[PDB]
Structures are given as structure tokens and as C-alpha cells.
Symmetry: D2
Subunit: 326 residues, 4 copies
């Protein structure tokens, strides 16, 4: 059987409450060893070694954990046949895309979580973790980039996003769809992500102890420019606009970011709209203002690519070409 | 035939480009008379009257236009049989929900936009506008609150949200689904919102020339607390958290809003996640911190209700009751 | 605590396999008492009483079980506070709609199943059953027609359909959306079905020991008229067409069904396409052929209403009005 | 510019009513040249030729039109740079998948329809046809198999299905998602189908004037075996079961098809359920009965492949392997 390393960061999958029927719970309580022990059928599928990286709610996920995870997977790539990362669902899609761009290991890296705590009735965590190990162990799962496995579905790290606040079926690749469905411990893969990922990226965080500072500003009716001005005053390297519709900006936000873009700051236009691309030739002349259009990358995912783009270049046209390639 | 009044505010429905096939256009440049005359079949179903209120892109929508729209509808209520509001798609879901809470006219208020400019090859605006007046002219549309009519579907002002950046079908009521479908100028209504609207709300904006200051902060991996601090430093009346997953906050954003809530700022927990409720009784103890759970209201819709809730009370407990009723 | 009767008919919820991690299983194996005892937290919320009516896979569901179920709920109404029906997922949407039309008990009737067998890892059945009793116990669930509770969601029996083949979240009200969502054993109801249900229908099956014979024919490229001719030759009281697109017929199937309609067979145009109404005033002149347009009712559900319609009348115009009202 | 041939079969795209306002229309009415002249901008992006193959509603589509279409494209492959096929929406998902498996030309074959007739207000036909020619003219569109272009989206011929009866956004690849989105005459392709197609399939219809007869039977509560028995009596080479849930069959229909499978009839288990695979190793022992699991292929699409499968082999294990490859 293949050897696979479970890297535990915490989440509701490692979360517990005082009863199976009450909704109240705390994330990142239970250890990796207790998770694997709860699913003995793992032994039938792979030789599992569990390592606790951190034990955190993914709402408190950060650059330092991102850095640790990338370096760990890249360092330990030769000493295992595949990786599973147990992780909270809140920012799974951010971590998944960071590693999708920064992992140089060509062996399956599969992220997994749970929407119900481990102590709850009909807890999704156990079967989620089994299916994650199935995917990480499947020979066919290699060279498809960093994967998320949730609700019997294999999702690429770029397009995967949390669509619902409670539903176990929350995770979908809302623009281009899933890679494959898992039935009876077997995957029928019909799709691979075309955007370049892992070893096909120039992003190398092996020596980096931090990432360039990129914040996100929300657009809406009567939107305050104070958030944008706060990141600008702090000398932020990048600002992602969660725009309205096709990445459009409230007038006062537009004013601040137009200034910022010409005074150092890399400005990427994304959208609060959960589905579809922020396009170039819309109502915003990106060439004129020196903006970057995120495309299908939602605000949090645009932040990831911009941060990593900023380790390579400050030039908008090159960042835009990066946003057209990765 | 019924008398219906068209209140124009701008949008891509009033948008124009040099090419029917190129995607480049500018918003809110075409006058209401032109949109009506473009649809001569309108005078088969209703006697239409056009009034230009503003001519702006809804990305620049604001408190002042909202207050104007509500006062005009409330003033002209019994001079007409119903209202259609032509409007940009970007923030139509915000304006729709504001009018839903503040309009005291029991006659149909139907908001309509277009995802392609008026000059576009297969422009959606014409049939959109026709179906908007059809809905506004339908006696069965009465007492359903403020409506959004897009892609042959009647959508309630509360749940309706922009789902896709470019798709004509973008507008869906993602949690509770639509009220009715339109075919051959007739509507089969099978739903009406339970949540109280229009004249059933205690909200009265008739004597208001400003609305309380409510800003929105985004949550993500390594989220900056500077946007939040900026808003409490400017003395903002309320702050809505665009939370991660089930309304969860990055620790730094949590600390700032926890301090703001104790100091007397109204703090509402919403979600970046496009469908589902931000619930009580998950990971955040709302009673302890004096936070409010937004429920199914997304950040920009949570802002509309928090603003109006603050014209009534500053008590977090009574703001939660309002978020449970409207 | 309220008194809640569990009527078990079988399904995957009562299904079993040799392994928790193996797909293979048989339906309708384990009895009511085993199901109820498997979730002892029911004792917190209701006084639960189990009755086995059948133990079958709902692929084998039939007129006889429907009649028994209906008469059982109608006769035993004033003995209990609510009913939960454990049932296979395959035809829950048919049974739910039958009871939606035939139950006269004004108390909550909630139907439940499981997409994973009882022996499965992360079995959905236990928490599905708990949430069903919650719904059946909630006073707010009254006067909403017969309900389906799956994946923390309360769904009206009319619009609810199986959307996916293996997904625990399979059940969606695809046209008009759910009635409410369940969190921490509490329901926020925002919707109720407008279409007449339960006591508001004239469909009394109390003294019927048989239902009118209604079959379904599928439409496709080069469709055979033989399935249709077989049902006409057996003298079937009604035929519903699973039409292509907006309930359109292949010429051969059209030819057979047209002649049958004029001979006194009730012919209902439904659609194979999973969402949207089969509409009047499309490509087919219903009035000329004496066909009935199923509207939002899919072929399965078109069958259930036609059967019940054929107990009141054989007149196409009357059946059409029945399809517009129920 | 590229040379693009347009092959017209009819459809609502070639459909007309007596009013832009009213829904009533007749399909396959308008000639290919009238569609071309209705889109002047075609000449900007390609040198377009038009040929009427047939002019029918696709509800009357059949094997004869399929074989002609496949042979035409295969013969005239060298004469042009790409094909667009104007086609009805009702059975376009069937024609697309047949061509997907039979056309040996490696140049883009793009299918288009319109949900609104050419005479309708905001008719989708014109911009649909433009965007089809864009896709057909894009070199990046090559080697992706037969395509469907509807609502600014490029969909693979295998997974694409009609999702809604009237909605312009009706066509979705519901299991694996679209290939690319079309903005401003340009496509961001991020996906290609892994399943083998066009010239990579062993299927050759070049010499065939007939297709193996394959019929479809529908499963539901109390399902008549008469339709299935009628096909077996007429000596059908194949029967596809529109199963319930995971391709399950009612008692009556199961016995008939179990009998049929033993006596040489190739029987494929599909599902009425609009998304997800009909899998092996559930409740039906496929080996024991000699049945074939359709996977993600819905009944009408399982028919297409079973017809082509039956020109190679009548061995159920050979046919199953074909359903795992194409
Ligand atoms: N707050 C949790 C939510 C979850 O995992 O379901 C986390 O992301 O860590
Ligand atoms: N920016 C435009 C978008 C549209 O109307 O489609 C607006 O909202 O005004
Ligand atoms: N065949 C089963 C499927 C399920 O219940 O999930 C039934 O409907 O009884
Ligand atoms: N009946 C038409 C429907 C359409 O094209 O929209 C056809 O398929 O030909």
C-alpha cells in the first residue's frame, strides 16, 4: 500500500461540542492521531503517518502556516507517496490555492475538512478523510495540482470555493466544475485544471519568512474609502477590490485605488459576485488606471496570486499576464 | 390599461457602446424616453410615464438616491397603479432591499436592469423592461414587497442577489428561490416572502436627509484589522463583518470589533459565502460580545437593515430581534 | 414533549451492507425500533412511537402503499401530534406529493430517507431522522402541506425532487426553493407553498382500493411510439409525456397520443428537463389536441396529480384547471 | 479570416411567431441565409458559407439526420476550417454527443440554438450564432470534441444537457462544468474533456444507413412493464432504463429487462435524476443480470452510445467497457 502523510492544521474536522445534537462547538481541539484512530479502514488503503503542524480554526489561518505547509511538503516530498492536509473549511480555498501555486512536489496533495464537528450526529469528517486518502493514494491524482476532496468530490485548488455557510455539500468549483467523483473508493477523473500550477509556476517560497502585504476592500452602495486609505497609509504592497458586478468600484474607492496604483500599490479588481470573471474590456479602463483584472479569481484567491506575483514583479502588465496564466 | 410610472436611475439598461459585438460600453447615458420608445409593445399592456431621477452606474449608488427613491414612491403612490425602477445590476440587490423596508406604497414596485448594453446584439433590456411592466401591472404582484424582475423571473427584494459577473440569468434568490416565472406576459406566483416588508416595517425615512454610517470589512487568511480600526476611528454607527464560513472573523478583526461592540458600535456578523445563514450558536458567542448574526442577509444587505435598525435603536439585543423579523 | 408517530416504509435509511466503506447494500432491511433506538437523542425532543407499514426499496413503491399511508394518517390523525415517514429517496418526491394531495390531517407530515445506508461511514440517516422529528414537532410546520426534510432543509412535497444520484444534498425544490433551514434543532420558515394541498383539495382516497392507471412515455431523437401504443392498448386512463424541452413530442408519439386524447385518454404534456414549467401557448396547441400542460410538475408528479384528477373528472379543461390550482 | 461552414437543421433559432411579445411560434421555419444576414458582424471574424441539411424542430430529430450530419462533416472536413450547426435546443444534447463520437474531422464542430424565436424581443439567436462562429473560428477550440455554444459558454458534447424548459441559460454541463467562457469575442478555455471523442473513437458510420434500434423506458412508483415488453416484442437491439435514483428499476420493469438481458437484448441502467453517475456496486448486481451502468450519461445520451456500442459488439461486458471510455 502507498505511504501518505496527514498534515493537521485543525478545523471543524478536528472540532468538538458538548453534545451530538447541539450546534455549539470549538475547532482545532482533537489531535491528528484521534482523527486517524476514528477511521481504521485507512489502514486497508494506505500506511498513514499523522503530523500536527498547528491546531487552529482556519478563520485564524495566516501566511506563517502557508509558508510552513509549502516548505514541509516540498522538503518531505521524497519520503512519502502522497499528502492529505486536514484543515478548516472557512479558508480551505485560500490555503489550497497558495499551495497549488507554491508546492513543487508532483505527488498528490489533497486537502479535506468537515462542516459538522467530529462529535456531531452524522459527522461528515470520517468519510471525508477516507475519500481524501483514497484520492491522495490514487495513481490518477498526480500532476492535477493541489486538490480539495469534500462530499465524494475531487475539486482543483484554483476554482474550489465554499458556496454555503452550513451545508456539507458547500464546496464546489463554481466556474469550471469538479475533476472527478468518488464512488466505492474509486475515482472517475474527466477533467484536469488547464491553468499552470505547482512545479509549472515561478513562485518559490523556500527561503521566504514572510509574503508581501495584500489586503481586500469591499464595494457596495455609499462605500467608505477609509478601508482603502488605511491599507494605503500602512504602505500595503497590494489591494484586491471585491468590486460590484464585473469588478466595478464605488466612486470614492475608485479615487483612492486609482491614486494608489500610480503611487506604488498593485491594485487587482476582483468581485464580491461569487461566480464568473472580472473581465478587462468592461466599464473600467485598466490600462488607463494601471489596474489588474482578477478574472475568475474571487477576492481571497486574487490576494494569494498577487502576494506571490509581488515576490517576482511590481509591473502591472506582468502581474496581469500572471493573472492570465495562473 | 393600468398606469405604471418608470423611475430611471441609470445602469447598463441605459448603457451604450460603439459596437453591438464589442463588450466596451459606458453606463447610464441613455434617457428614459428612449428605453420606453425602444419597447412600443409596452402600450399593449400599460400606460407608461417616464421620470429620470438620476442617470448613474449603480456602482456609484448611495444613501441620497435611496432616500430620494423611497420619498418619491411614497409621495406619488396614488397617482399611479405601480412603479418600475430602471437601475444598474451592480447594487440593484441593495436598493431593492432598502425600498423593501422603507416603501409604504402597497402597489407593485418592480426593479429591472440589463446585463448587456442597449446597443448589444441580443440586448436583454427590452424584454426585461416589458416583463418588469407586466409584473408591475399584475394585480397578483400586490403585497409581495419590492420586486426584482430579471430573465423572465419575479424575485423578492430581500433574497435576490447578483450570482454571476456577466450572465443575463445572474439574478437568483439563492436561499428561498423566486416568487413566480413569467411566460406569454402572465405570472404563476407560488411563493411570497414570510419576512415583513414595506408598510409592515416600523422604518420611516420620510423626514431623514442622511442614514446612519455602516461600513463593511472583509475576512480572509491574515486579514488586516486596519479597515475595521479606520471605521471605529471615524465613529461609524455600525460595522458589518463579511465573515469567513458561518460568519467567523480573523482574530485581529475579532479583537477590534469586540472592542467596538463594548464601546457601543453595532457589529453584525455576515459571510463572504454567497448562500446560507450566519447563525447564532456556532463558534461565536453573540450574547457575550454583543454581536448580531445577519442570518441569510449577505454583507451589503446586512448593511441596509443595520442602517435602518440604527434609526430605531442602538441596543444589540433589539437589533438582533429586527434581524430575526425583517 | 409532543407525540410523534414514525411510519416506516423502508428505504436506504433502513438499508445495510457488509462494510461501512463499501457501496454495496440492500434497502428496507432494519425495522422502525432499530432506526429510532439508533438515535436516542429523539427522547430530548419527542415521545417517539414506531409502526412498520412496509419494508421495501422505494423503487418498488406503488399505489397500494400510497393508499394505506394516506388512510393511516387520516384515521390516526387525532391520536398523535405529528407523523414522520421513513422512506426511500428514489420515489420520495412521488409519495410526498400523493400525501400532499390526499392527507386531510392538518398536523405536520414529514418524509425522510438517507442517501447512505445505516451501516455506511458518516451515515446521513440518524441526523436526517432527528431533523425530521424536529420539523414534525415544530408548531410552525403546521398548514405547510406534506414536507420532505433532507440535509438540514424543509422542502414542500410539490416542488421537491431528487437532483443528484448519490449526493446527500440531492433533494432540492428546484423551481420555487425550500420552506426553511434547520440549525440547532430550530427552523426559520420564510416560505409556504401557494398551490392548494392536503385539506384544500377535493381528492378523497378513503374508500378507494385502486388508483386510475397512468403511465409515462419518454421523448427523444427517433422516439418509438410502441411504449405509448402499449398503454393505449391496455386502455390506460391517463398518459403523461416526458416531453423534450417545453414538453414537445416526437411526431410518432404525438400521433399516438393525439388519437388517444380524442378517444378519452387523459394526455398530460410534462418534460424530461429537470427545471421549468411545461407551458401552454408554446409549439403545441393543447386546446386543439385536448392535451393538458403539466406546468412545473415533472413526469413523476404529473402522474400523481392526473391519477387523482381522474377520480373527479375525465374532462381535459377541468384537469387543466386542476393542474393550475394543485 | 477562417472559412466557417454553417449546417442548418432548423430549431427555434430558425423559429418565428406572429408577435415579438407573444410566446406562440413555429420551429424550423427560417432559412440559413436569413440567419446569416441577421448577423452582419459574422464577416468581421470569418468567411461564412451556409447549407440547409434539413429544416425541422429537433423534437423530430432522428438517426437519418444524425448519419447525414456525421458523413457531411467527415466528407467536407478538408473544404473548411470549422463547422457551426444551427439546431433546435430540445435534442441538441443528443445530436452533439452522436457527432462527438462519430465525426473524424479534427476541426471545431460547434452546435447552436436559440430559446427565443428570431422574431422575439431580446432574441438570443443572433448573439448565440456570432459566439458559435467565434468558437468555431478559435484555433484553441480544436481537439476538444464536438461543442455546444449557448449563453457566452462553451460546453462539451458529452456532459451538456438542457436544464430548463424556457431559460436562455438552460444549457449546462451539469456534472463536470463548461470548457470556457466567451467575453468580447475571446475564450478563456480552462478545461477539456478527458473521455475519448471524434477521431479517437473506433465508431465509423461512413457505410451505415441504419443505427441499432435503442428505446428508452421510464421508472416511477407502480411503473408499467408494458413499454419495456413492447420494445422486447419488436426485437429492439438495445433498451435504456430511465431509472429512479442510482439507476434503480421498479419490480415490473426489472423482471422484463432481466428477461430481455438474458435473451440477447443490451440493457443500460441510466437515471431520470438529472445529475450524477448511475454507478455499479449499489443495489443492482450488474454482473448477475448482465446490465450496463451508464455513469453520468442520462437516458437520451446513454441511448446514443448504446446504438454505437451495438455496431461493434453485443457482449454486455464489452459494452460496459465502452461506457467507461466514451
Ligand atoms: N471555523 C471552521 C469551520 C469549519 O472548518 O467547518 C474552520 O474553518 O476552521
Ligand atoms: N455597472 C453597471 C452594470 C449593469 O448595469 O449591468 C451598473 O450597475 O450600473
Ligand atoms: N433505492 C433506495 C435509495 C435510497 O433510499 O437512497 C430507495 O429509494 O429505497
Ligand atoms: N422545439 C425547438 C426548441 C428550441 O429550439 O428552442 C427545437 O428543438 O427545435
Amino acid at each position: 500500500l502507498p505511504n501518505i502523510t496527514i498534515l493537521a492544521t485543525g478545523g471543524t474536522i478536528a472540532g468538538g461540542g458538548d453534545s451530538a445534537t447541539k450546534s455549539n462547538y470549538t475547532a482545532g481541539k482533537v489531535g491528528v492521531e484521534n482523527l486517524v484512530n476514528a477511521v481504521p479502514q485507512l489502514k486497508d488503503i494506505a500506511n498513514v503517518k499523522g503530523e500536527q503542524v498547528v491546531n487552529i480554526g482556519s478563520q485564524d489561518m495566516n501566511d506563517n502556516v502557508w509558508l510552513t505547509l509549502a516548505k514541509k511538503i516540498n522538503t518531505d516530498c521524497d519520503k512519502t507517496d502522497g499528502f492529505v492536509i486536514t484543515h478548516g473549511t472557512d479558508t480551505m480555498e485560500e490555503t489550497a490555492y497558495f499551495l497549488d501555486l507554491t508546492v513543487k512536489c508532483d505527488k498528490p496533495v489533497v486537502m479535506v475538512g468537515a462542516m459538522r464537528p467530529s462529535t456531531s450526529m452524522s459527522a461528515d469528517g470520517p468519510f471525508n478523510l477516507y475519500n481524501a486518502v483514497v484520492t491522495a493514494a490514487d495513481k490518477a491524482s498526480a500532476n492535477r495540482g493541489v486538490l480539495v476532496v469534500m462530499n465524494d468530490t475531487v475539486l482543483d485548488g484554483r476554482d474550489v470555493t465554499k458556496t454555503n455557510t452550513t451545508d456539507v455539500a458547500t464546496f464546489k468549483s463554481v466556474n469550471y466544475g469538479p475533476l472527478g467523483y468518488i464512488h466505492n473508493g474509486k475515482i472517475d477523473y474527466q477533467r484536469t485544471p488547464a491553468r499552470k500550477h505547482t512545479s509549472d509556476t515561478p513562485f518559490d517560497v523556500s527561503k521566504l519568512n514572510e509574503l508581501p502585504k495584500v489586503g481586500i476592500v469591499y464595494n457596495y452602495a455609499n462605500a467608505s474609502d477609509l478601508p482603502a486609505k488605511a491599507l494605503v497609509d500602512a504602505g500595503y504592497d497590494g489591494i484586491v477590490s471585491a468590486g460590484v458586478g464585473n469588478g466595478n468600484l464605488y466612486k470614492s474607492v475608485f479615487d483612492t485605488l486609482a491614486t494608489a496604483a500610480k503611487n506604488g500599490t498593485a491594485v487587482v479588481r476582483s468581485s464580491r459576485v461569487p461566480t464568473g470573471a472580472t473581465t478587462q474590456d468592461a466599464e473600467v479602463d485598466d490600462a488607463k488606471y494601471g489596474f489588474v483584472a482578477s478574472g475568475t479569481l474571487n477576492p481571497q484567491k486574487a490576494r494569494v496570486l498577487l502576494q506571490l506575483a509581488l515576490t517576482q514583479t511590481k509591473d502591472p502588465q506582468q502581474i496581469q499576464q500572471i493573472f492570465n496564466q495562473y
